[PDB]
Write a protein that binds this ligand. Structure first.
Ligand SMILES: *[C@@H]1O[C@H](CO)[C@@H](O[C@@H]2O[C@H](CO)[C@@H](O[C@@H]3O[C@H](CO)[C@@H](O)[C@H](O)[C@@H]3O)[C@H](O)[C@H]2NC(C)=O)[C@H](O)[C@H]1NC(C)=O
Ligand SMILES: *[C@@H]1O[C@H](CO)[C@@H](O[C@@H]2O[C@H](CO)[C@@H](O)[C@H](O)[C@H]2NC(C)=O)[C@H](O)[C@H]1NC(C)=O
Ligand code: NAG
Ligand code: NAG
Ligand code: NAG
Ligand code: NAG
Ligand code: NAG
Lengths: 375, 379
């Protein structure tokens, strides 16, 4: 039989790069039983035009799976949503391989959606781990008000309540808001001396500037942030010594395609060795009934382990996301990011360099300076 | 201007033609001349193509939706459309009645229903009134069950009862699955009342297993939320007698009456704007051609549309787009396989009609108890 899968990509060169990968995938373990195809489209400015073009792709092929990317990001959020609503109507399993928004994990809204990269919510796992290793026990949290930030608040709390630590003074602020010094002053008389930031590239620049007038960047105090906090217009204003972090091979946009076709190909062979495969419907128009075996496809696709992954081991969790991902810690010295360690799945192993704390010292500055003057 | 969309029909087209001419049907003080658009075979292509095709002309100032139940994916599409074209929309139907909790940051979906938590609030009033105070929770692996499972534990803490819950069970109830494993978990159960949460397709499978395991007779009674029931009127087989579910006030009404309520909200909100700020907020909506960079004026009309009272009812909405404090009712399945209104819930206090639960039997024939007797006193 002929199994047809499609994808949506950015550049025509990448689309041809995609087709080359499926050819090598076919020659890897293929046979005379089932053969494969590929089909590709390109982005458009108006999302409504994309949605119509999405099932212009669908009428032309018995699509079994879709792929989506957003290498050009005038809107990093609204680019991969039109494909999800259109394909999710027929339970077509759509895979996304470069998108880090946390909204796409709520499966009640998006019925079928998978990933090959963990989102921003899973970032706080490394934050808590560094706390245990470095023995920091009094933290100040600082988060935005959008759903992108509120997810981090819940993630840290359940990870800390398992040991009954109860982090103190979680502060919120409206996104896109200037003059946050009315909020920082409330965090000026607090005992804890370590701040954890999680916001957007536009808000992070403001708080970095706002901290310059409060001596919040001075010695004794230690900052630690997320991936998006130090990649953008805010890096120029960032204070030195911020122990940020990054992804190992994110934004590659090329190794993911090789990984995505490998896991998909293993799934279609594993599934087709069964009964009652019925094929998807032909046509955006003229049909109203969902693919009768769509949920079955997503069910088997969840636990499909993959060994020879260019990015590494590929596996999925209960909600659907790449688990056991890699994280590479940074540190800002003389306006240049330098690696100071590696996070590998569960633990952290730093070596080969000495961490430069923001004040310029060379000894680990502990927090919790007991305020002698009481109220 | 107000638009009306028909998205599902066993052809009422006499009623559709009845809504063509009446530009003076309503008594609301506004230009309520409606334009109607019909839809056959609702789907992402036809729904998207026709919606701004009609919006491309006549400068309509809002849309009103209606469709059939058992379709759920059409809920997000309407939200997606309103995020771009920046036009307020209102859904009064069964299909898009179920509430989506996360909505797009700049959308104006304005759903018409009740949240999952609010339904649980009314049920626990019923449960405590008869003082059953002991239940077991059964949920399938349906999207959104984790949200529901937090509802019971949170509500059971903000109350003054022991609320001795025995156990919680989870089991896959699709077309394919191991019935023996579910049989093992079902037979190993003992509880007076059950609170189950499942979709309609799971419900038929679940209650089929219930009778085989002997969990249907007068020794038990079931509670399910608004989702699990049928369309509204024709319950299938295997639904046990004595079912309980909470449904909003418009449970029993005519489709033509619902539309008049829908147009009333848009008309009353529009006229209320003219009195306060003035002169008919700018009605404008466009499809793909340069849509929605930012909304500095229509967003101000959004707030005016939230609070509205009409014909002695309160329709105040929440930023989440679902009704706040509606006059919910409770229905039950009697011994004629129909639905009978049992008790209202108005202004925070729960009324009733049966002082005691009549508990049926295998073949009607009401069951009545020696140890229970009616006492008459005075002050
Ligand atoms: C295997 O994949 C190939 C390559 O995608 C499939 O050929 C493609 O077939 C579609 C359907 O007719 C063609 O789409 C049409 O293209 C014209 C070009 O102007 C366009 O105007 C139409 O609106 C329509 O979209 C597509 O062009 C064609 N591919 C190429 C490179 O020409 C083939 O059918 C697949 N076969 C199987 C069994 O999966
Ligand atoms: C009921 O709804 C009306 C309808 O708009 C509300 O009118 C708003 O009133 C507030 C009060 O200052 C203004 O700030 C808003 O701008 C008004 N809406 C506009 C101009 O679109 C009214 O406030 C609501 N509540 C009550 C109690 O009447
Ligand atoms: C290559 C590598 O570092 N693998 C790590 C290992 O070092 C660590 O001991 C283990 C659990 O701590 O998790 C894994
Ligand atoms: C706004 O910024 C000014 C800086 O000139 C500051 O004095 C003022 O306190 C800020 N506003 C608030 C509410 O703190
Ligand atoms: C710290 O801030 C105070 C006022 O907030 C300012 O007067 C002082 O100069 C700052 N410290 C330094 C070292 O600049
Ligand atoms: C992306 O990943 C591939 C494979 O890991 C690697 O060869 C390549 O150098 C990376 N970068 C780019 C820009 O392709
Ligand atoms: C990524 O994590 C794996 C897991 O231990 C590790 O072996 C590898 O060196 C890490 N870095 C890569 C693949 O660049």
């Amino acid at each position: 039989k002929i199994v047809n899968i499609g994808a949506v990509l950015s550049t025509r060169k990448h689309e041809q790069m995609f087709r080359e990968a499926v050819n090598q995938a076919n020659k890897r373990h293929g046979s005379w039983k089932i053969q494969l195809n590929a089909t590709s489209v390109t982005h458009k400015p108006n999302a409504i035009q994309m949605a119509l073009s999405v099932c212009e792709d669908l009428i032309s092929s018995q699509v079994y799976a879709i792929l989506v990317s957003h290498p050009p990001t005038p809107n990093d959020h609204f680019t991969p949503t039109p494909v999800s609503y259109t394909a999710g109507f027929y339970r077509i399993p759509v895979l996304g391989l470069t998108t880090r928004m946390s909204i796409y994990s709520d499966k009640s809204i998006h019925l079928s959606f998978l990933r090959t990269v963990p989102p921003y919510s899973h970032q706080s796992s490394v934050w808590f781990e560094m706390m245990r290793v470095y023995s920091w026990n009094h933290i100040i949290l600082l988060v935005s008000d959008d759903h992108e930030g509120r997810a981090a608040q819940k993630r840290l709390e359940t990870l800390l309540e398992e040991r009954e630590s109860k982090a103190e003074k979680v502060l919120q602020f409206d996104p896109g808001t200037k003059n946050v010094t009315a909020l920082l002053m409330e965090a000026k008389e607090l005992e804890a001396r370590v701040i954890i930031l999680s916001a957007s590239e536009d808000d992070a620049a403001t708080v970095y500037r706002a901290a310059a007038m409060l001596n919040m960047t001075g010695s004794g105090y230690v900052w630690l942030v997320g991936e998006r906090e130090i990649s953008g217009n805010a890096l120029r204003y960032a204070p030195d010594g911020i122990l940020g972090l990054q992804l190992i091979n994110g934004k590659n946009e090329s190794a993911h395609i090789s990984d995505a076709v490998g896991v998909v190909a293993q799934a279609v062979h594993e599934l087709l060795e069964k009964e009652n495969i019925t094929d998807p419907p032909r046509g955006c128009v003229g049909n109203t009934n969902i693919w009768k075996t769509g949920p079955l496809f997503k069910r088997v696709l969840m636990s499909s382990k993959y060994a020879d992954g260019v990015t590494g081991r590929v596996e999925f969790n209960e909600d659907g996301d790449r688990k056991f991902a890699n994280y590479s810690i940074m540190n800002l010295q003389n306006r240049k990011l330098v690696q100071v360690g590696i996070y590998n799945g569960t633990h952290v192993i730093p070596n080969d360099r000495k961490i430069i704390w923001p004040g310029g010292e060379t000894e680990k500055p502990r927090g919790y300076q007991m305020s002698t003057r009481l109220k | 201007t107000v638009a009306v969309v028909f998205s599902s029909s066993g052809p009422p087209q006499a009623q559709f033609r009845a809504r063509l001419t009446p530009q003076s049907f309503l008594d609301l003080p506004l230009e309520i001349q409606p334009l109607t658009v019909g839809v056959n075979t609702t789907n992402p292509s036809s729904l998207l193509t026709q919606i701004c095709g009609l919006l491309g002309a006549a400068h309509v100032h809002g849309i009103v939706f209606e469709d059939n139940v058992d379709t759920e994916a059409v809920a997000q599409i309407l939200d997606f459309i309103s995020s771009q074209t920046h036009v307020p929309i209102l859904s009064i139907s069964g299909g898009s009645a179920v509430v989506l909790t996360p909505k797009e940051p700049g959308s104006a979906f304005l759903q018409l229903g009740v949240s999952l938590e609010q339904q649980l609030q009314v049920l626990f009033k019923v449960l405590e009134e008869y003082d059953w105070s002991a239940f077991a929770v059964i949920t399938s692996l349906h999207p959104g069950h984790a949200l529901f499972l937090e509802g019971v534990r949170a509500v059971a803490d903000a109350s003054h009862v022991s609320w001795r819950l025995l156990d919680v069970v989870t089991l896959e109830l699709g077309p394919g699955g191991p019935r023996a494993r579910t049989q093992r978990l079902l037979r190993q159960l003992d509880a007076p009342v059950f609170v189950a949460y499942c979709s309609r397709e799971e419900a038929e499978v679940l209650f089929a297993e219930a009778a085989q395991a002997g969990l249907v007779g007068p020794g038990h009674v079931w509670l399910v939320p608004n989702l699990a029931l049928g369309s509204t009127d024709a319950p299938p087989a295997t639904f046990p007698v004595g079912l309980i579910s909470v449904v909003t006030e418009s449970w029993r009404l005519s489709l033509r009456q619902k539309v008049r309520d829908g147009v009333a909200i848009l008309a009353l909100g529009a006229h209320s704007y003219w009195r306060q700020h003035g002169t008919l907020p700018a009605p404008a909506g466009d499809c793909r051609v340069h849509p929605g960079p930012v909304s500095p004026a229509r967003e101000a009309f959004y707030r005016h549309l939230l609070n509205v009272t009409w014909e002695g009812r309160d329709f105040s909405f929440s930023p989440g787009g679902y009704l706040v404090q509606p006059t919910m009712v409770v229905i039950a399945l009697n011994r004629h396989r129909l639905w009978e209104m049992v008790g209202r819930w108005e202004h925070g206090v729960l009324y009733m009609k049966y002082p005691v639960w009549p508990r049926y039997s295998a073949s009607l024939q009401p069951v009545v108890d020696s140890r229970h007797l009616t006492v008459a006193t005075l002050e």
